[PDB]
Amino acid sequence: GNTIPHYSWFSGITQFQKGRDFKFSDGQGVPIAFGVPPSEAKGYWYRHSRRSFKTADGQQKQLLPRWYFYYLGTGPYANASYGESLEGVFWVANHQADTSTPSDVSSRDPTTQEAIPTRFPPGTILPQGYYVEGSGRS
């Protein structure tokens, strides 16, 4: 039982190859939103381990981390200080973003809204070993 413990507004990027970095430029790696404009497209890091398991047939899963995305003002570090870039971490938001303040985006009921494939605006790059999917799964 290694299901995501939370209901993210949308899915994450899917890793294919282990042991790679998370690299992008200013205002890149910002995930296209429902509800909130590029103007308030702004968030920070998050990552989950989705551990593998082995079944009756002796076959074990081989799987990789996923990258998870929360808006500024809401998240398990909702009130992170703007600039909190850690080891293995890269703080993000769009060039139009204020990022002096919690954003205008939160509060989604998964009763109505299931996970959505994550998409990033043209200009954003996919760090080596990753490419985004999010086929209705976070």
Q: Please state the structural category.
A: mainly beta
**String of helices and strands:** EEEEEEE
Shape: globular
End-to-end distance, in Å?
15 Å
Number of helices: 0
Across the major sheet, the strand order is: 3-4-1-7
- What is the alpha-carbon Rg in Å? 15 Å
Percentage beta strand: 5-15%
Domain count: the total is: 1
**Helical residue percent?**
under 10%
**Major beta-sheet overview:** 4 strands, antiparallel
Protein name: Nucleoprotein
Biased composition (Polar residues): 98-115
Domain CoV N NTD: 5-134
Subcellular location: Host cell; Virion; Host endoplasmic reticulum-Golgi intermediate compartment; Host Golgi apparatus
Question: Could you explain how this protein is built, in words?
Answer:
This is Nucleoprotein. Residues 98-115 have a biased composition (Polar residues). The modification Phosphoserine is found at residues 103, 135. Homooligomer. Both monomeric and oligomeric forms interact with RNA. Interacts with protein M. Interacts with NSP3; this interaction serves to tether the genome to the newly translated replicase-transcriptase complex at a very early stage of infection. Belongs to the betacoronavirus nucleocapsid protein family. With 138 residues, this protein is mainly beta. It has one domain (1-138). It has strands at residues 13-15, 42-44, 47-48, 66-67, 70-71, 92-93, 130-132. The chain has a four-stranded antiparallel β-sheet with strand order 3-4-1-7, with no helix packed on it.
